[PDB]
Amino acid sequence: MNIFEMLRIDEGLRLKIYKDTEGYYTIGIGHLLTKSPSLNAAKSELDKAIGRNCNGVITKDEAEKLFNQDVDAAVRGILRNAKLKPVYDSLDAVRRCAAINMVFQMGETGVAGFTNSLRMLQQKRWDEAAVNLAKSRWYNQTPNRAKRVITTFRTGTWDAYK
Numbered sequence: 001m002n003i004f005e006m007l008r009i010d011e012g013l014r015l016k017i018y019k020d021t022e023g024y025y026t027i028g029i030g031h032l033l034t035k036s037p038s039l040n041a042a043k044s045e046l047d048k049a050i051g052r053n054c055n056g057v058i059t060k061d062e063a064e065k066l067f068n069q070d071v072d073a074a075v076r077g078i079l080r081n082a083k084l085k086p087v088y089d090s091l092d093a094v095r096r097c098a099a100i101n102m103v104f105q106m107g108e109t110g111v112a113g114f115t116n117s118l119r120m121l122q123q124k125r126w127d128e129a130a131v132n133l134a135k136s137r138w139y140n141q142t143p144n145r146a147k148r149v150i151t152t153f154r155t156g157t158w159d160a161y162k
């Protein structure tokens with residue numbers, strides 16, 4: 001297991017524009033295109049991202065390329081964020097994958113309310129952090145995926161993905 005395999009499990013792979021769990025146009029391995037309700041707006045974002053006129057469809061290679069860019073962007077966003085970087089750097093590699101997973105799903109803004117969870121994670125109070133992480137819209141709206149991520153933070157193992 002690694003972050004790519006983890007997120008590939010959580011996000012799936014679809015080569016045509018689809019709607020994510022929130023109803024937003026997405027493609028590939030969970031690549032958000034737009035929050036606009038306009039399919040044309042999503043198609044424009046797709047063409048811009050791939051560099052050709054795709055009319056809503058990409059290849060597996062293209063999906064994997066976008067996915068690598070998106071994982072890297074999540075990592076570099078963590079490293080540039082004064083709140084997230086100290087916690088991230090305190091974690092082991094398996095738990096760092098759980099952190100990337102959350103940033104990939106929700107962005108830096110979506111994790112802004114996790115201040116108390118971040119403190120518990122930095123303190124290595126794993127069961128306490130796991131309880132706190134579940135008290136969230138995130139957990140309630142995507143409970144099976146949140147449970148896997150939370151188990152990863154709780155245990156520092158890949159058990160939830162095996």
Ligand SMILES: Cc1cccc(I)c1
Binds near residue numbers: 078111
């Ligand atoms: C709980 C959490 C989420 C995103 C990033 C980090 I570091 C920690």
Ligand SMILES: [Cl-]
Binds near residue numbers: 144
């Ligand atoms: Cl879920």
